């Protein structure tokens with residue numbers, strides 16, 4: 001049985017090829033003494049041990065700990081002998097050449113996998129949506145990308161990266177809330193606000209009219225139960241926190257808005273394919289889960305595009321797992337047997353084989 | 360790459376119409392008598408090979424998705440379509456065909472009029 005592993009900035013999504021969902025989803029965190037603990041437990045012992053995120057903005061940045069993430073994945077979460085399963089992993093769009101070789105070397109040298117493959121996260125999400133052509137908006141905990149894809153392959157020259165995503169949004173709810181009079185300013189506190197984020201936040205189709213209703217109506221308000229017990233009334237951040245996605249100034253970021261990068265991404269692509277892109281805008285990643293975000297992108301990019309353009313935002317309910325699900329389908333295909341990088345092939349060519357087998 | 364799938368070896372060798380159905384993550388040939396009848400619960404891959412005057416062949420690949428096919432099937436069909444195209448040296452034009460919204464070109468492939476029928480194979484997940 002092949003394994004599928006989607007490593008994110010915040011969460012690890014891991015499981016078996018063939019399954020319809022990841023059997024294992026856990027925090028991408030390694031804790032080391034104040035020799036280490038992994039994910040669901042490291043937040044536990046977080047009193048004794050310093051915790052760090054080995055992946056930043058979708059890129060692997062601490063190899064030593066990343067090696068810990070994988071070990072835990074195979075051994076504590078998946079409960080497999082890694083040396084007997086072909087393993088599929090995922091990577092960000094534009095992962096540096098050396099990262100891809102380092103990930104392949106580790107898998108064959110320190111984990112002894114019999115076979116291995118690396119695919120681009122966003123392309124997997126496109127596949128999971130039953131499509132070969134379109135532009136993916138992928139927005140997780142640590143990064144947001146716009147990835148245009150044509151007849152199966154990403155168009156690297158037109159990809160947009162934006163370091164504003166999920167955590168950045170938590171920190172702003174978790175700063176705007178206190179403006180109301182609440183706490184929130186601890187490495188256990190945002191942890192509560194991110195839960196508020198996930199439950200209460202939504203994207204408004206019109207900001208102003210949403211404003212003109214928020215500071216003037218105890219209807220656009222919800223009450224939430226902290227763990228302490230004290231009840232708090234979420235307002236009006238509900239619609240303000242994700243607004244940062246469209247207006248990045250709110251976090252003082254200056255960057256273009258996700259609708260804008262989407263337009264821009266498409267304009268870097270051959271004119272003959274722009275229609276297909278506009279009509280196949282696929283959303284992927286935890287930070288696209290906000291109620292109302294598909295209706296807003298819609299409106300926002302048809303404003304930007306020529307009237308004649310047929311716009312369409314595709315937002316599958318399972319899009320938290322689209323990347324993983326895309327990998328689960330790919331590694332299950334009868335035709336995938338020969339796509340794998342074998343240990344044989346690795347022994348012959350070493351880690352640079354990845355750039356030839358794995359576009 | 361370099362698929363060894365028996366169906367791939369047969370794909371696109373002479374002018375005509377070839378139709379496969381996704382079944383449990385595999386590409387399974389459809390009986391020729393049954394061409395044009397599609398299960399709304401399934402996904403299919405269609406290759407139209409046309410004789411070019413220059414002697415080489417023209418390929419159009421269509422992945423057709425029924426209203427009720429499962430995500431593994433539509434996903435597989437899209438992926439199978441990329442692989443077949445690759446296999447054929449990138450010479451194929453790829454087309455996404457959704458039940459009820461198929462291109463005039465695709466519709467024109469079926470002499471007796473294309474037909475939908477309820478049902479299909481179970482999800483390979």
Ligand SMILES: Nc1ncnc2c1ncn2[C@@H]1O[C@H](COP(=O)(O)OP(=O)(O)OP(=O)(O)O)[C@@H](O)[C@H]1O
Nearest residue numbers: 008009010011058140141142143166285286287289
């Ligand atoms: N319903 C929800 N509404 C909004 N945010 C959500 C929701 N569910 C999860 N999230 C957020 O999505 C993030 C998890 O998404 P995801 O797993 O796709 O990211 P990642 O892969 O870990 O990071 P990256 O892709 O940037 O490397 C967290 O920020 C989490 O708070």
Ligand SMILES: C/C1=C/C(=O)O[C@@H]2C[C@@H](CC[C@H](C)/C=C\C=C\CC1)O[C@@](O)([C@@H]1CSC(=O)N1)C2
Nearest residue numbers: 010011027028029043141166167170190191194
């Ligand atoms: C259910 C859940 C989802 C998730 O996305 O977790 C990821 C991973 C998590 C790890 C760090 C925390 C303290 C320890 C354990 C967390 C467990 C479960 C968290 O740190 C995030 O929370 C950060 C911080 S605040 C935000 O926006 N991302 C994202």
Ligand SMILES: [Ca+2]
Nearest residue numbers: 008009121140
């Ligand atoms: Ca991700």
Ligand SMILES: [Ca+2]
Nearest residue numbers: 400401479480
């Ligand atoms: Ca079916």
Ligand SMILES: [Ca+2]
Nearest residue numbers: 444449450451
């Ligand atoms: Ca082609």
